[PDB]
C-alpha cells in the first residue's frame, strides 16, 4: 500500500483528492508517491505539504477543543482525558509518519536549496506540532529537534535564496511562530518577523507581478503576527 499503484497515478489521485477536499486520501496517495523512492518535484512537494498540513490541522483543531474542555473539568470521569489522548495519539502518529518520510529518505537525497530547505522546514513544523501536545522532558528534546531543523533550514535559506523566496518567507514565518508559541521567546519571534519582513520589502523591486503577489501574501502574515504580538 500503495505499492501496486503507479507513481504518476498516485500524483494524479492526490490532485483529485485535493479537489474533493479528501485530505486523508491525499496524504496517503502522497505517502505512496514518496515511498516509490524517486525525489519529488516542486509541485509534488507542495502536494505532500498541503495533504499533511490539512490532516494534522484538523487533528490540532480537535485536540485544542478537547484540551480546553479537559482543562475546565480541572477547575467527573475519565472520558474527556481518554478521548483527548486518543486524538493526541492519532496526531502524534501522523507527525511521526511525516517525520519518517523526511528521514527515509527525502532530506538525504535533497541537494538543491529549494528542496532541502522545504524538507528541513517540514521537519521543524512536524516537531513543532509534536511539541504543542508534549509535556516532557520529552517536551524539551522535541522542542530542540524543531529548533535544530528550523535553524539548518534558515542557514541554507539565507545563503541560497533571495529574501523574497516564498519558501524562505514561510520558513521564517513558521520559525517565528515556533519562538512565540513553543519556545517562550516572544522577543526572538518579533525580531525574526520584523527582520524577515524588512529584508523582503527591500527585495520586492526585483520581482515580477506574480512573484510579488506570492511574496507579499506571506509578508502580510508576518505583519499580522507582529500586530498581534505588539
Amino acid at each position: 500500500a500503495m505499492g501496486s499503484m503507479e507513481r504518476a497515478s498516485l500524483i494524479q489521485k492526490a490532485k483529485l483528492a485535493e479537489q474533493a477536499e479528501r485530505y486523508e486520501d491525499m496524504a496517503a496517495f502522497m505517502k505512496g508517491a514518496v515511498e516509490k523512492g524517486e525525489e519529488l518535484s516542486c509541485e509534488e512537494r507542495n502536494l505532500l505539504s498541503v495533504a499533511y498540513k490539512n490532516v494534522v490541522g484538523g487533528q490540532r483543531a480537535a485536540w485544542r477543543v478537547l484540551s480546553s474542555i479537559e482543562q475546565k473539568s480541572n477547575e467527573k470521569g475519565p472520558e474527556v482525558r481518554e478521548y483527548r489522548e486518543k486524538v493526541e495519539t492519532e496526531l502524534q502518529g501522523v507527525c511521526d509518519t511525516v517525520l519518517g518520510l523526511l528521514d527515509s529518505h527525502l532530506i538525504k537525497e535533497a541537494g538543491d536549496a529549494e528542496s532541502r530547505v522545504f524538507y528541513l522546514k517540514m521537519k521543524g513544523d512536524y516537531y513543532r506540532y509534536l511539541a504543542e501536545v508534549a509535556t516532557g522532558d520529552d517536551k524539551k528534546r522535541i522542542i530542540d529537534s524543531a529548533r535544530s531543523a528550523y535553524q539548518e533550514a534558515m542557514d541554507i535559506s539565507k545563503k541560497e535564496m533571495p529574501p523574497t523566496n516564498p519558501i524562505r518567507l514561510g520558513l521564517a514565518l513558521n520559525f517565528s511562530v515556533f519562538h512565540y508559541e513553543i519556545a517562550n521567546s516572544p522577543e526572538e519571534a518579533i525580531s525574526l518577523a520584523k527582520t524577515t519582513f524588512d529584508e523582503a520589502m527591500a527585495d520586492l523591486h526585483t520581482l515580477s507581478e506574480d512573484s510579488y503577489k506570492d511574496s507579499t501574501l506571506i509578508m502580510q502574515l508576518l505583519r499580522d503576527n507582529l500586530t498581534l504580538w505588539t
Binding site: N46, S49, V50, K53, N54, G57, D125, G170, L173, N174, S176, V177, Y180, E181, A189, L217, I218, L221, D224, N225, L228, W229
Partner: peptide
C-alpha cells in the same frame, strides 16, 4: 493564536 504558513 499566531498565523503560520497557509495551505496554498
Amino acid at each position: 493564536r499566531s498565523a503560520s504558513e497557509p495551505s496554498l
